[PDB]
A paper describes a structure:
The asymmetric unit contained a hexamer with D3 dihedral symmetry. The hexameric structure corresponded to the possible biological assembly that was implied by size-exclusion chromatography and the PISA server. The six chains in the asymmetric unit have virtually identical structures, as the average RMSD and their SD for the Cα atoms between all chain pairs are 0.15 ± 0.03 Å (maximum = 0.19 Å in 15 pairs). A Dali structural similarity search of the whole monomer showed that αFFase1 is similar to the hypothetical protein BACUNI_00161, which is used as a template for molecular replacement. A metal ion was observed close to the active site (green sphere), although the buffers used during protein purification and crystallization contained no divalent metal ions.
Here, we identified the BBDE_2040 gene product from Bifidobacterium dentium (α-D-fructofuranosidase and difructose dianhydride I synthase/hydrolase from Bifidobacterium dentium [αFFase1]) as an enzyme with α-D-fructofuranosidase and α-D-arabinofuranosidase activities and an anomer-retaining manner. αFFase1 is not homologous with any known enzymes, suggesting that it is a member of a novel glycoside hydrolase family. αFFase1 did not catalyze any reactions when DFA III or inulin was used as a substrate, and there were no significant peak changes in the reaction of caramelized sugars other than those of the four peaks. Because of the significant bias of equilibrium toward DFA synthesis, we propose a common name difructose dianhydride I synthase/hydrolase for this enzyme (EC 3.2.1.134). Each monomer consists of β-jelly roll 1 (residues 3–200, green), β-jelly roll 2 (201–396, magenta), and a 51-amino acid–long α-helix at the C terminus (397–448, blue), englobing the whole structure.
Residue numbers in the entry:
A (entry chain C), D (entry chain B): 4 to 449
B (entry chain F), C (entry chain A): 3 to 449
């Protein structure tokens, strides 16, 4: 039996397991309230095994007004109050940047360095904490049009990249937000009865940003003769997607670009440096070219490449992806994945990227992340208003004072309810790891 | 040395192609079968060892409801389906709404006592509620014209790429429990092998289930009220049951048709899997859209491994969804129960139906059953009885009524005869398909 | 152990990436080749053993038809294509409509005395009729901007993920039969191996065919008339031929461009596959949309293994369709003939052209040939000749005509010089590409 | 100065007035809760004057579940809780037929009959209690796409037909609904310093329904040769749009058709009988032909005719209109406006119509309306479900009891708030007429 479905025609003596946000009270809070300024373990899994599937969704609301909804009862209703502020009954505002303030962190085989350290959004192909609806073979986002075109929009994420581990999987959320946020997850794996071959390649992901890129000509018009006649062979100043020591293969990237001059951000060539070569052996032709579009980026999202968020729908930013699944970029010792930031590094745009690759352990490269203050989208902000109240009527002052009093009483009651859910999250964290161990030992006893 | 999902294209295989098709064995342009009312028909039997690689089908079921000025004998040899609007006054072949539920597809492997596939024709091909939706996924597709979409029994092209291996025999049948015949076009592609498949090859299985109503404890309570949300359900004994099967194998997903009655949300219930007879489920989900890898309700998205076929927002309160577990199958050594709470802790009493898909080693230990036809029809609202009283008729109106009734009495029997002729062709080509498959098998084995 | 279509990501391979690209080897921003008029150019030669894993290209072909106020020497170093509306009065680089048909892609493996791929540039990349459509499938994609869609020669991005293994040699050329040069951007990715591929590795092949007109017996009879439908065709001697090849391998699909003349339906014709010299087809289809896994005509769907690239409802009577047999290949030990009746029983006399894709062990037994350029052009209606007479001119109108003609006399030769320089760059970079691929092969093999 | 704008260039010594649902507490409830099973006077105006413009919108919710929103505070928030029932916090369901259960009733010069007596929806070109978004010269509906496609959808209605009156205008809502409903209105007029000419034509509107139409061949296929060769000259059995004695002109209609056989409802000809003639002097060709469409109805709404709700978008029903503003159908003694219900009255469909006309007083015969039971849309109904509860856990029974307890407490609290808002409507009804009288008398004193 041949072809991409053939393994369905053969049984495998492997045991399914799942880390999930399931309500371990048996009730309908099948999510975790991830605490502010804390890391939480979604679970630890003893290998040998393989992550086969991840699904998540999330919400981060800030309470900004008093509500006439009873906050104790409200805590047990639906998790997110999707109610328009115009109704005057509640105001749970959208937190715009929570997708960049939270990280997903994965450590294999009890290494002293993570193999995945990426902003929560970026890892699931939400760039700029601004989701786009799209499908590809390994990553998908299902975003409602009602929610689309907003920073911090709720959406469903799914990852089908396999993540093998011979000894240990530790999956954490690091929440650098001053706000807690709601996380639903289903993380599916299988456990094996024998070790994986020792040269099994493990899933890695890292995140980078150059903001600004150090361009030599950001004020020169893109594609002017002067710009286009500048030379760049060795790519020393190229944007660096990935720079890693070891044996394995690059499987692709997402790239978020905020373009400032309003011409074109994408004349820059991909250039790959394999096993320490001085000049790149793989030379590309342009950035949309690298993403397999042409004459700019199109509103297409195909199995191995395309657009997640189109520049034409936004205030000058693009989110793009390419997967190298059947055409990976292999290396024995070292790989540097670069892209010129504009032709010959002309431009000074805001570039950020997730690199995904597989490699044999140990992970020699110590993966780092920019601090939270360096991960936030660049957005224009309104000037200072400095409003001066008119002379208030006694009625108007009483309205203000009554409202303020409702706010003084209400906010603490919402705070109490967030603290109860955060206590559930920490409790279910250790329960998830305990159940995963029980399942491991029961499977091995066999 | 070649790697990745295209790699088997770079190596030759000493296997012989065959195809069961509705091709016109007169050599003419009726490349379809008129499946008779209330009969089973064998699409074909193939001797193993082999593997089904691809199925394509399309179908039509019209009821003659008015006389036509189209000569019915010549009309039989024109295009098979009269796509003519009734407002033209020249013909009326009405759409049969529920034919996708009235017909079953049935597949038996290795001359077993029980079928391994027994599913309504529509549901098997990811048509839920006998109501097609246009979509693509990796193993199943439906191609539905926008002019036909949004109605029960709409014509559309269905395709299945799930491989179906068989060491000894494949028998593919249509069980037509409809009072009406229907038109079936098919191409079923397969390859034949010169050596047996390995001993614990996993065989393709599919089974259909419905709970209508689900036995909810709180169907009149508002979904997501605090009272509903604080009820506990750990053990899932009253969960909706997608699949309950003894064997060694793996679940590869489902479609799920839900008609939701209260106008809130049907989908808070968790998927819960019970592997190898465990009392509590080892795999705990978070919600029904969550299981379908959507969030905050279902979206109008159809992706390679999950999504929406028919969105609730486009219908009279019903949703058709799917998930494929192709790279993330749910394995079992001895037993699998795939459940979903029907609303949080089985609160709701909606109309749930599902197709379950799985592979397992033979034998098929579980006798696969189907609900009878009267339990497979969509729940639809009906107009109040009319009981119209005729006005006083003129001579001219009574003569128009008489002339028309006379034309109808002459015309319906002439159409009936043309159905019966096409049914004879289907019964004949059924036998011819198997006989050719056998000749092809024997010639391959000789060579 | 790891299973499913992603499994090969979880093991390392000791294989070395390479890439043939139109990268500016001056290190500047002309990362494209100006392919000369009436010339062949080698994109590169690679020494095996290795495998092509990915191709991306885009292109542009404009005809300078008016003088420009843009400095033509400086213009050469700006963006490569002046996407400037003719109504502005400042430049006019007109679209060349048929350049996708006037150029070929030509691939030779292991220094054979025939190419294994010889297909028009467009059709190879699933641009039928020199008229792009936006679509995705598993092996081939076109990303076409809406602003460009719905015209002949529209620019678009093409990509190919079919693997192309080779033990000894890969030589990739463009044959430009156009009177005009064209711009080609390309990234051709491959890997090199440290030992030979198995002897019987199947190599990628592609051939192109056109029957214009098809030799129909009743082009003037209405499609699906009782007279047409009762004609028999078993043996399919007169069927449209997609592929006719001697060897050991498997067909993996096609694209099919049909221009239909009578305004009914072109697709009643059945696929008929003749395996290993059999006189009667063993694989019998039901219809042409049925082969493409649509039904009741073609839909505006493009799914992973089949569908519509350009829909007849969006054009002046032409359709471009595809089907991939990746999990369901049609295998042959000695010979394969892939045919489709051109209308039922070869009734119709439409314009049919096709790309066939197959893999086979070497040798390529027969030369792959192609119809000459005059036989590859789309069939388009033509305006009556408008023999304009000028009115009596004012001195001012004559001076404007004179001034314009003089600008044009000065301007055109300056653009010609700029094309000749870029053509010289393409010929220089052709040789550099091959030299670098040889250095990389040798350094890889050294360790 | 010529053309349709020419009157903007001449001053007129006329005084503006407006009847409105404005909050006469000075607060932000600028609507009336129209009580169930009651008539309420929007206002009475002393003539001479002319209505120039009407704007309304409305809402009718049924409380069907208990809410965690404090119901007393909720009464002073936004007037309509546009909150999805899936959130679990409130359930104010849409009342589907309120547009047909309430009438608009207008009486001129204290006549012993109204001159307008039409269901609230149909008057404002909402057919079948089912809004559709459209514009025309005298009537508009502005309907949000998120509300569209359902019975009882909220939308804004506007009327620009002038309504002159020499002595008196009385404008009422007759609410035959068992539920109250929210009405916002702005009714603009001018008052004049002298009588209008006594031959001034007054605005009339009347509603009719034939359900079923009394067809001779409802089971025969439409456009069958048998149907098409039946004759109808005199049109005795035609659907009647208008049948009135006096001197005036018909200015058009809306027509709601629910079609049963699934072919074409519209082969019937318009046939007008002017001044008592036995045979119609104006012979039409078909129903879509009368609506100035062809080959069925189109999704077009033009200044003088078209589609409000397209059969292609619904469960078998169409709403259409035609205005005869520049091409009115005049009569000296009598007008009968008829349409064959199918060719030669073949069909037995559900037809209802609003007829609009102007005439010199008196209104000869009382304008009557079918009672509420005869005004409801024909809708298919689900089979009786007859659910049986399973054996309940103690926890499930306590859940049901707690919810019932919340409901028993909550519903009467909402009832109380409806009753207070109804008192406001009745109070402002009287204040509207008193202020209109003070305005009349102040203008007249000037
Ligand atoms: Ca470049
Ligand atoms: Ca749940
Ligand atoms: Ca045929
Ligand atoms: Ca007529």
């Amino acid at each position: 039996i041949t072809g991409l479905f053939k393994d369905l025609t053969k049984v495998k003596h492997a045991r399914n397991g799942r880390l999930a946000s399931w309500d371990q009270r048996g009730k309908n809070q099948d999510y975790w309230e991830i605490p502010a300024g804390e890391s939480i373990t979604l679970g630890e899994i003893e290998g040998p095994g393989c992550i086969t599937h991840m699904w998540m969704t999330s919400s981060c609301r800030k309470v900004v007004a008093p509500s006439i909804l009873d906050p104790e009862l409200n805590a047990s209703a639906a998790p997110v109050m999707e109610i328009h502020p115009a109704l005057g009954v509640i105001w749970d505002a959208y937190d715009p940047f929570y997708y960049r303030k939270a990280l997903i962190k994965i450590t294999w085989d009890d290494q002293d360095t993570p193999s995945v350290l990426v902003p929560f959004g970026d890892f699931f192909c939400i760039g700029n904490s601004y989701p786009g609806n799209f499908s590809s073979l390994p990553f998908n986002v299902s975003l409602k049009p009602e929610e689309a075109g907003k920073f911090g929009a709720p959406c469903s994420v799914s990852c089908y990249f396999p993540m093998p581990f011979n000894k240990k999987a530790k999956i954490e959320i690091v929440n650098d937000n001053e706000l807690p946020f709601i996380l639903y997850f289903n993380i599916d794996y299988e456990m094996y009865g024998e070790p994986l071959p020792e040269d099994t390649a493990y899933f890695h992901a890292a995140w980078h940003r150059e903001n600004p890129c150090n361009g030599w000509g950001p004020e020169l018009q893109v594609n002017s003769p002067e710009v286009n006649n500048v030379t760049n062979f060795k790519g020393e100043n190229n944007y660096t997607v990935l720079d890693v020591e070891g044996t394995g293969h690059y499987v692709g990237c997402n790239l978020t670009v905020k373009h400032f001059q309003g011409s074109w951000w994408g004349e820059g060539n991909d250039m790959f440096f394999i096993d320490g070569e001085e000049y790149p052996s793989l030379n590309g032709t342009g950035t949309e070219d690298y993403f397999n579009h042409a004459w700019g980026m199109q509103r297409n999202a195909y199995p191995f490449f395309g657009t997640i968020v189109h520049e034409g729908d936004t205030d000058g930013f693009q989110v793009s992806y390419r997967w190298h699944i059947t055409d990976p970029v292999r290396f024995e010792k070292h790989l540097k994945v670069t892209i010129e930031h504009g032709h010959a590094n002309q431009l000074s745009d805001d570039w950020s990227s997730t690199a995904y690759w597989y490699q044999i352990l140990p992970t020699a490269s110590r993966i780092t992340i920019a601090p939270v203050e360096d991960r936030l989208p660049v957005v224009p902000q309104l000037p200072e208003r400095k409003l001066v109240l008119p002379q208030l009527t006694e009625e108007q002052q009483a309205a203000r004072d009554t409202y303020q009093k409702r706010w003084k009483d209400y906010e603490p009651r919402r705070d109490t309810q967030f603290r109860i859910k955060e206590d559930k999250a920490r409790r279910e964290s250790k329960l998830n790891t305990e159940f995963a161990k029980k399942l491991r030992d029961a499977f091995d006893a066999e």
